[PDB]
Design an enzyme around this catalytic site. Structure first.
Site, short mmCIF file in Angstrom:
data_model
loop_
_atom_site.label_atom_id
_atom_site.label_comp_id
_atom_site.label_asym_id
_atom_site.label_seq_id
_atom_site.Cartn_x
_atom_site.Cartn_y
_atom_site.Cartn_z
N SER A 151 -5.85 4.41 -1.23
CA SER A 151 -6.85 4.06 -0.25
C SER A 151 -6.19 3.17 0.79
O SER A 151 -5.49 2.20 0.44
CB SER A 151 -8.01 3.33 -0.94
OG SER A 151 -9.06 3.07 -0.05
N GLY A 152 -6.35 3.52 2.07
CA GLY A 152 -5.72 2.76 3.15
C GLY A 152 -4.28 3.14 3.49
O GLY A 152 -3.65 2.49 4.32
N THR A 156 -7.13 8.57 6.41
CA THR A 156 -8.19 8.87 7.34
C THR A 156 -7.61 9.27 8.70
O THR A 156 -8.01 10.28 9.28
CB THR A 156 -9.15 7.69 7.50
OG1 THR A 156 -9.69 7.34 6.22
CG2 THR A 156 -10.29 8.04 8.46
N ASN A 198 -8.79 -2.20 -3.45
CA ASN A 198 -9.07 -1.63 -2.13
C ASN A 198 -10.49 -1.94 -1.63
O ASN A 198 -11.47 -1.62 -2.29
CB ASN A 198 -8.87 -0.11 -2.17
CG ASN A 198 -7.50 0.28 -2.72
OD1 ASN A 198 -7.39 0.90 -3.79
ND2 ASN A 198 -6.45 -0.08 -1.98
N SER A 201 -12.71 1.88 -0.65
CA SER A 201 -12.18 2.97 -1.45
C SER A 201 -13.18 4.11 -1.56
O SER A 201 -14.32 3.90 -1.95
CB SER A 201 -11.87 2.51 -2.87
OG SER A 201 -11.44 3.62 -3.67
N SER A 202 -12.73 5.32 -1.25
CA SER A 202 -13.60 6.49 -1.33
C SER A 202 -13.78 6.89 -2.79
O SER A 202 -12.80 7.04 -3.51
CB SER A 202 -12.99 7.64 -0.52
OG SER A 202 -13.79 8.81 -0.66
N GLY A 452 -6.21 9.01 -6.10
CA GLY A 452 -4.99 9.41 -6.77
C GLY A 452 -4.83 8.76 -8.15
O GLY A 452 -5.66 7.97 -8.58
N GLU A 454 -3.77 6.38 -11.07
CA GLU A 454 -3.78 4.92 -11.03
C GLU A 454 -3.75 4.34 -12.45
O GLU A 454 -4.18 4.98 -13.40
CB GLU A 454 -5.06 4.43 -10.34
CG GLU A 454 -6.33 4.77 -11.14
CD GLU A 454 -7.62 4.22 -10.54
OE1 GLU A 454 -8.56 3.93 -11.32
OE2 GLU A 454 -7.70 4.09 -9.30
#
Ligand SMILES: [Ca+2]
Ligand SMILES: [Ca+2]
Ligand SMILES: [Ca+2]
Ligand SMILES: [Ca+2]
Lengths: 791, 138
Positions: A151-152, A156, A198, A201-202, A452, A454
């Site tokens: 994330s980040g 995006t 994050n 986070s999606s 992903g 983790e």
């Protein structure tokens, strides 16, 4: 023999050093930067290094040694020049620069990439989009662009570059682009949440499709969505939050909305109050939040800090966005009402009688029933009782009412909450999709974004599911790369080349096989008189005692796992490495079923909006089912791969954190791909590159040759073994490390080289004769072919 | 329909057409070489011949298609006549130099002479048809 090697370094990932001693499973390394600070390194963590520490290649396949350390170094060198994109064959590696580089996303750069084969231009996300498009057009086949990353990590932005490229090049410009992008605050509000690592986070799998007609022109877009994380709806750890919408609404809603929805600070809601109840805010936005919205934790510790996120401001932006896509105030309040309905539902408690609603839960019941358009008594009954038939196998039966225990009432309550929030999420996505609809389409190009692989100090069922999902995506990544490599070898005329492939199907089967897989064994635990996490765990170890991918926690090298009992956890050997799972709560997290009478209740709400939302399977198996739907979609397409990398944890520019990036290269499956490629010809170089590299060592006679014939002469002169070295159509291909060996041959003995080149003279002269001779014969045949076709 | 040797030989011919070496032949490259050896085909005749063999329909010709795209001796004899630009039955250094330069080969005069010399079996400083064919297969 004195050559530099890469050896582990705790913050750079690898450091350069020399091997000064050997041991049975370790090497003694002397770092180049320290005269005697030698350290031990496991043999398989020491890699050969490129001699030229300033080398920069656009394709890591051009390296003389292709491995994780040399890859890490090559992208580091490139990142230092603001070259954020690098290939591994057709795979794009993209490191987030954390600053704007307009130059490379301009209209002229877009145009420069159109119709260009990957590799005829510098590495770029645009080359990936264009390849997807050309393959779509040529092969009549929809395409997936599969992006990994934390994330980040620039994901995006990366998706936006693809969409920008496709709409500008092959559509009518900004229109579809803007509609998709402007809707994003809405998706983030309902599908993103703060996690421990994050802030934004999606929590769902997102596949953004650009649809094309039979003329390969863009007609519209479609967001397919998968696997929204349900458990977060009801509970979170202390450094995490529920979905952003809950905090945006609490911090931002007008006092009139607050009164109508009966909101108050997040610490008043069970579905929020186990998590972090603080708002994202700055000094200024904090002043805009009424004190009655602020939890004790927020008042004591202050706000959470983020350069972008702000609950009060994001509420406002979300509202703006809803208007920008024609979502009126009535539908908007319908959204907010369901959200608050869910919040109040969670506050309802039960006590032993079956069970009853506690007296103190009467307000929560009333608010919940009002917001969800349900009868209070009906809700009270359906939360505390269920209906059953008096038979199961077809004999004449009747309906009975069965009182629920408190724990079952808690479950029924949370089950309803999860299904309501999930259907609301489904509705938001569909609503977003109504902003760029299309009647028909022939194909799509889609970009995938999903959480992903983790791991943390403590890994629970949530990590197990995520890593399972990633284990299956990695298998897909591996198959497709294997197929591309074998096809490339054939296209280059390399002959018969079986590539050795260690599948990870065994790890996947450990998890998901029917009956004997971990998920089915977890389901089985539900059926026992006294379900327990310990018995489930023992059953896993018992059933799979000989399995290569499974171990008891004691076998871990880490100290934090040493005291974990055999029946308290297990280790899975994933593609990205070993993960120790603590199995406490696996049984309960496996259950979220909503009994029928309560589901019927909500399905027939007095409220039309709620009814329209709705207009015995375990959590693990629903996860497997949905994951498989995601894979079916991917498997029906041509696939391209992007690995987005986050260079540091501070959103700073020009700051390459080596160990963090190495860990991402591993977790993203890039190391798994490199291991795969070692079974083939992972190093290769075009005749032009080889010509420029080595002509300085050759006589002038040879330097005047075209690059292919130069390389033919050189390859022939040297007499290289035919197993290690393959002369392709456009490149020379090498078995692992053989380009380095070729390089050593070219430098190590000039007198030998000179004589070998002299001896090749006759062959070279004939080859050059035959080239122009057979070319002329070719021209004649093409001449004749025109005449032949004209008769 | 071709032996492995002849396929290998045409692969190097293919490379002369494939100027930039990306492994395919464009329409522009195709005519370029043909024109360089004195042919004059039309843009329509090139495109039509390409389309016939353009199996995967990408618009360029790969090597397998170049093969399919391609009485036997008369072509070999006509190829021999490409070099002998005055038809005296013998190819000269200056005439080899002509073909080489049309094709885009870069070499010196001594190199041209050395090619002539290596192809010359009898010994007269110019190459005929007997050794031309013997050189074309080796
Ligand atoms: Ca070409
Ligand atoms: Ca073709
Ligand atoms: Ca002549
Ligand atoms: Ca002669």
């Amino acid at each position: 023999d004195g050559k530099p090697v890469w050896a582990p370094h705790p913050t750079d990932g690898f450091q350069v050093g020399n091997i000064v001693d050997i041991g049975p499973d370790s090497l003694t390394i002397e770092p180049l930067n320290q005269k005697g600070k030698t350290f031990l390194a496991l043999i398989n963590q020491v890699f050969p290094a490129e001699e030229d520490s300033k080398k920069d290649v656009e394709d890591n396949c051009s390296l003389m040694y292709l491995n994780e350390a040399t890859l890490l170094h090559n992208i580091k060198v490139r990142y230092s020049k603001d070259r954020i994109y690098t290939y591994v064959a057709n795979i794009l590696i993209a490191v987030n620069p954390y600053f704007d580089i307009p130059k490379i996303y301009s209209s002229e750069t877009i145009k420069s990439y159109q119709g260009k084969s990957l590799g005829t231009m510098p590495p770029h996300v645009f080359a990936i989009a264009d390849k997807a498009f050309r393959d779509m057009k040529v092969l009549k086949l929809s395409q997936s662009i599969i992006v990994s990353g934390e994330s980040g990590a620039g994901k995006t932005e990366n998706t936006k570059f693809v969409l920008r490229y496709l709409t500008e090049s092959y559509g009518t410009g900004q229109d579809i682009y803007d509609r998709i992008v402007e809707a994003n605050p809405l998706l983030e509000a309902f599908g993103n949440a703060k996690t421990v690592r994050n802030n934004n986070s999606s929590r769902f799998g997102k596949f953004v499709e650009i649809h094309f007609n039979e003329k390969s022109s863009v007609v519209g877009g479609f967001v397919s969505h998968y696997l929204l994380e349900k458990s977060r709806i009801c509970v979170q750890g202390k450094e995490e939050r529920n979905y952003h919408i809950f905090y945006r609404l609490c911090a931002g809603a007008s006092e009139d909305i607050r009164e109508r929805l009966h909101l108050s600070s997040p610490d008043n809601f069970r579905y929020l109050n186990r998590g972090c109840t603080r708002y994202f805010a700055n000094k200024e936005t904090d002043k805009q939040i009424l004190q009655n919205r602020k939890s004790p934790e927020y008042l004591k510790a202050g706000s959470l800090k983020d350069p972008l996120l702000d609950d009060h401001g994001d509420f406002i932006r979300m509202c703006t966005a809803m208007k920008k896509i024609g979502l009126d105030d009535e539908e908007k309040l319908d959204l907010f009402r369901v959200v608050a309905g869910v919040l109040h539902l969670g506050n309802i408690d039960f006590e032993e009688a079956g069970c009853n609603l506690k007296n103190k839960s009467t307000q929560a019941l009333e608010y919940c029933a009002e917001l969800l358009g349900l009868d209070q008594d009906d809700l009270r009954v359906s939360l505390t009782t269920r209906v059953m038939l008096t038979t199961a196998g077809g004999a004449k039966g009747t309906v009975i009412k069965v009182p629920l225990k408190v724990e079952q009432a808690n479950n029924a309550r949370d089950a309803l909450a999860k299904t309501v929030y999930s259907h609301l999420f489904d509705h938001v996505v569909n609503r977003v999709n109504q902003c760029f609809p299309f009647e028909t389409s022939s194909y799509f190009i889609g970009v995938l974004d999903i959480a992903g692989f983790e791991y943390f100090e403590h890994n629970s069922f949530e990590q197990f599911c995520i890593n399972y999902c990633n284990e299956k995506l990695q298998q897909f990544f591996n198959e497709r790369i294997l197929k591309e490599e074998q096809e490339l070898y054939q296209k280059e005329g390399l002959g018969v080349n079986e590539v050795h492939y260690v599948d990870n199907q065994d790890c996947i089967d450990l998890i998901e096989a029917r009956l004997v897989g971990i998920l089915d064994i977890l389901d089985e635990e539900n059926r026992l008189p006294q379900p327990s996490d310990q018995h489930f765990t023992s059953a896993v170890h018992q059933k799979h005692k000989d399995h290569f991918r499974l171990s008891i926690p004691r076998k871990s090298k880490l100290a934090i796992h040493r005291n974990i009992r055999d029946d308290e956890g297990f280790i899975i050997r994933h593609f990205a490495g070993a993960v120790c799972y603590e199995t406490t709560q696996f049984v309960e997290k496996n259950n979220d079923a909503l009994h029928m009478s309560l589901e019927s209740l909500i399905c027939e709400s007095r409220d039309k909006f709620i009814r329209e939302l709705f207009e015995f399977i375990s959590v693990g198996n629903k996860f497997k089912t949905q994951l498989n739907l995601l894979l079916d979609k991917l498997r029906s397409t041509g696939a391209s791969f992007i690995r987005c990398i986050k260079p540091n944890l501070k959103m700073t520019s020009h700051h390459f954190e080596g160990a963090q990036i190495l860990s991402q290269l591993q977790c993203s499956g890039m190391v798994s791909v490199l291991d795969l490629m070692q079974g083939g010809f992972p190093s290769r170089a075009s005749f032009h590159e080889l010509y420029n590299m080595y002509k300085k060592y050759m006589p002038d006679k040879l330097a005047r040759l075209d690059p292919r014939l130069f390389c033919k002469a050189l390859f022939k002169a040297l007499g290289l073994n035919e197993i290690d070295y393959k002369f392709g159509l456009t490149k020379v291909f090498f078995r692992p490390g053989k380009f380095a060996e070729f390089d050593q041959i070219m430098k190590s003995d000039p007198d030998h080289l000179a004589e070998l080149v002299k001896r090749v003279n006759h062959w070279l002269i004939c080859s050059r004769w035959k080239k122009v001779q057979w070319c002329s014969l070719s021209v004649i045949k093409l001449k004749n072919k025109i005449k032949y076709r004209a008769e | 329909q071709l032996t492995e040797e002849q396929i290998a030989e045409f692969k190097e011919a293919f490379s002369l057409f494939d100027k930039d070496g990306d492994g395919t032949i464009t329409t522009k490259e195709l005519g370029t070489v043909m024109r360089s050896l004195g042919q004059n085909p039309t843009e329509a005749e090139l495109q039509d011949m390409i389309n016939e063999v353009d199996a995967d329909g990408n618009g360029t010709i790969d090597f397998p298609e170049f093969l399919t795209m391609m009485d036997s001796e008369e072509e070999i004899r006509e190829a021999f006549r490409v070099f002998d630009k005055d038809g005296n039955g013998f190819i000269s250094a200056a005439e080899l130099r002509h073909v080489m330069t049309n094709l885009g080969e870069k070499l010196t005069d001594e190199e041209v002479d050395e090619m002539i010399r290596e192809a010359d079996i009898d010994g007269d400083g110019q190459v005929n048809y007997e050794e031309f064919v013997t050189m074309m297969t080796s």
